[model samples]
Target: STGSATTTPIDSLDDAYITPVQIGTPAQTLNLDFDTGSSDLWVFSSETTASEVDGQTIYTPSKSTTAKLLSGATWSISYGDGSSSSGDVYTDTVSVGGLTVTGQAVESAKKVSSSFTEDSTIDGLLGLAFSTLNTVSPTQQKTFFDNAKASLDSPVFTADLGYHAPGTYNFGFIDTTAYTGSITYTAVSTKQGFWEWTSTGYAVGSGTFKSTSIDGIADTGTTLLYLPATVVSAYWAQVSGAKSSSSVGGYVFPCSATLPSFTFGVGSARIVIPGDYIDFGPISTGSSSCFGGIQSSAGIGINIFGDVALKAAFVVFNGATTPTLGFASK
Candidate 1:
């Protein structure tokens, strides 16, 4: 069996993507962010303190006859951005695009950070990272993808993200028509609980490829493409009036300034991101300076190939005894 789910960007910035998920006996639907960077299928739910629950959707386990509390189980997660959530646990029927898992671990929020409560567009997060990263104390649980892999026709999931458009997350099989050209496959290192790979090289605009081996993780949850400062500075150097600004948090340039396309290598293949994609809108409303989609990963422990990079190509997250990551141009 397989599943196909559509994901939509939350705003014009395409900061995050969310997909609908159904949980429990009577199928309570909630729009959730399918994050591949972390492993914890958590939800803002009835268990969350009323003060912490804002205008967000909440999953109520009490309403589901099939729901049962996982005795003494609990979970807590703190994000790189400072947002966090902690909660009790329950196991119930859960489904995404008709693919169901009967005993899926569902963490119900008891406390949440300000950002999560303020962001009403997202209901919760459905983690797609390795189960080893799960935060449930005493017993880390398997991710939805891991549990569903056995029943799948193929143990894989493909991410076809778009620039300000609807995307598709297909489980089990790759959609041939969704992308053009043969896919370039790379071995993945999962010991760190990430879809980590060694990227071959990179090119700025029309420049020749610079043969540098860069290691990074494919994180669908992150909004920007974060590379080493050296690479980021080189790209910005090609653009006039671009400079790093503490006020803006990263690099920013005049809105009228033109930007060059970015290209990166995957094995022998190259995926080019148009300059327009790098123009990640303005720093604020009516601001003359605009933010960049590509930023430095110096602060972050690992370089992250987030939505900015993934949106320009098709990606396959292969779930096998040893994982593999495939990239293709669209």
Candidate 2:
């Protein structure tokens, strides 16, 4: 049977998409960020320092009848955004929508960085990356998806991210109604433990599409689109008043500036990012300055097709033998 779950964007941050996850017996429901960049199911919990966790839900393993401690096992994870969490391990029943997996390693945090402590709404992270990336030490753990894949009809999942709207993460089966046009497939390079693919080239707005092959990862955890420095400079060159702002960090433009749609090539398929979406809202309410959703991946090392890029299209994460990616316009 196929399973499906709805994902909601976090308040004004608009940086992450979260879904409700049921952990332990009787279902201790927690809102978790479904991150494809890393592999680990971690949660804010009783084990977390009370002073470190504010207004967030916590999972207590002792309270769940099905929970079992994994002796001497622990987990720690630090994200690129500087958010980190570490804790002991417990095996329990975890479910998303109608899909359930038994004995999944659920990491309960004993410590969380200030970045995580400040974001009280997000209770944890549900990593959908390769199981090999899981953080549990001594004896590594499998992700929820890995434990449940054998039961899935086709071992496939789809991520349909939306802009200022709700979306669905479907498993086992692909919903043909969610997207228009045929899905263009690309082989993924999984050596880095990511759903990485190489783009044939990109263009600014209606400009001619180039033929530069750029390798990058489709990361649902990150908020913005990151590309090569030269590519970013090329795009901003087309928009008047767009400048690299040290104060704002990355590129920023006047609220009224006309933005050109950005496009990326996947083989022969061209996926476009709407100009309006490029304006990641104003720097602040009543402010004329706005932060750009596309930035240079100079320091980041790899180009990231984050939410800003993923939201414009329907993505298929093919967990079949080859780990391919299917993209189609919504």
Candidate 3:
């Protein structure tokens, strides 16, 4: 079986990639974030507190004959940023693109962080990472990708994230036409419950390639590329008026500054990110200082190649017995 879905950007900066999904008997459509950083298919629903609604679409299990309550089952998730969401569980028929998964675990949010209500464009998150990362308890649930893998033509899925445009997510097979050259394969370590992999090296602009092992996760849920402070320092150094500011909490520079491109390696393959991408808009609505799309991940201890980098390449999440990731130029 194969499935496909379009991910449309909700912001000019491509800050959110919202995809359409069908849930329940009559197929209630909801726009969700297909996040690869976490594992839990959760949504805002009728069970959510009225105060948390905030104009976002709600999924009501009571309205669906196909939805079944999962007694005693519950799930909760917390972000390092201090936001959290928790809710009861239900089994329902969920569909994405053309793929259907009957009895898929649908976590109905009873409560969500204050931060979630701020984004009316998103209903909730559809986790695509390994199910081991699921926050469900008593009866851990499998992610959509995990349950659909058996019937898929191949145990693989791909993410083609766009920059300020619509992208796509494909299940079962690779869309060769979406990319160019050969897909470079790299072993992924799922021990940490993330799509974690190591890069052979990186280069800033036209500089010589620096062959150093850089471990990071391919997180579509994240919005920026986070690397070591030293590396981030190197990239920003190329710009004239760049500096790290405590007030801004990251590296910032003049909005008009000439930016350098960033490149990273996937084994022997090199993926180059355009300089414009690093200039992540302005610091404020009318400010001249702009925050960089690349930041230091020193606090987290693990670098993150987020949307800032993923948008520049085609990524395949291969969920074999031993999983691997594939990257290619687009």
Candidate 4:
């Protein structure tokens, strides 16, 4: 339901967050999407009119003499925040680090918001997380992954999120480099796609929530976990100063207080989400008094845990073997 984007790899912060092969000069620099809900790669551009964009990263053809725009294509995206941006489609030779993937499809946003227009610290998005979330296919343009399938190390690509650490999310490879531990993999039923999986249970304090046995989805695009009201309230009860207050987004707490850490059990694996994540920025929504906890939803569905929960553990998508998602080491 939102715009699609993709992510690229970066060896160092000084070397630019992404590396892509271009037609001229030092090649072109492309921003990558770090998302699980959508898949695509787009950059801000100079061609975009000043009105459509507010303040985010824009790729200027003038910035890079090698960058080129696709003559017959156009691109547009809408975020969960309800903001939208659009531009023309372009093609250029893009290389991620030392890996060069030609004919890379990109979007040059002509119209943008202040967030996407002026931000310099964060460039663009590299959406190498999930293919099903991508907009490319036999109908639309080919997804970045669909086209670069031959260049990947494995048919399966995983995103390992790092907490309040600096960068929000870390893409590609779960850093299994030092992990020689045995893996308990569970394959999902073919009926589902995009690594659909479930959790065995959840543990808090010394008590295991009996209602932990439930179905859920893991999406990188979302920042919070959308769960049942009882579950959300129960979670906060385990923490101090955790009261339901109007939040910048729906949750807030005083700057003081030590939050308890609880681990979420996905399949046989456990992913522990820290309580500090409950504290967010800008207390405008309902943060005036009391704190906030998990709220109830109107519908019947499993929990949709996002970045905060995702970062506490190692998640794997076994779409190549079976439509399964496994969480380990929260």
Q: What is the clash tally of candidate 2?
A: 0
How well does each candidate superpose onto the true structure, as a TM-score? 0.98, 0.97, 0.98, 0.74
Candidate 4 deviant stretches above 4 angstroms: 1-25, 51-57, 62-71, 118-120, 129-139, 166-174, 178-181, 187-195, 211-213, 247-249, 281-302, 318-323
Q: What are the Cα lDDT values of the candidates?
A: 0.93, 0.90, 0.93, 0.52
Compose the digit string of candidate 4's lDDT tens values, residues 97-197. Answer: 34455666766666666655544444455554455454433224555545655545644445455554423222233446412343446555423223445
Q: Cα RMSDs of all predictions?
A: 0.9, 1.2, 0.9, 6.0
Worst 10 residues of 4 by lDDT: 1-10
Model 1: weakest 10-residue lDDT segment is 273-282
In TM-score terms, candidate 1 sits at 0.98
Model 1 gets an lDDT of 0.93
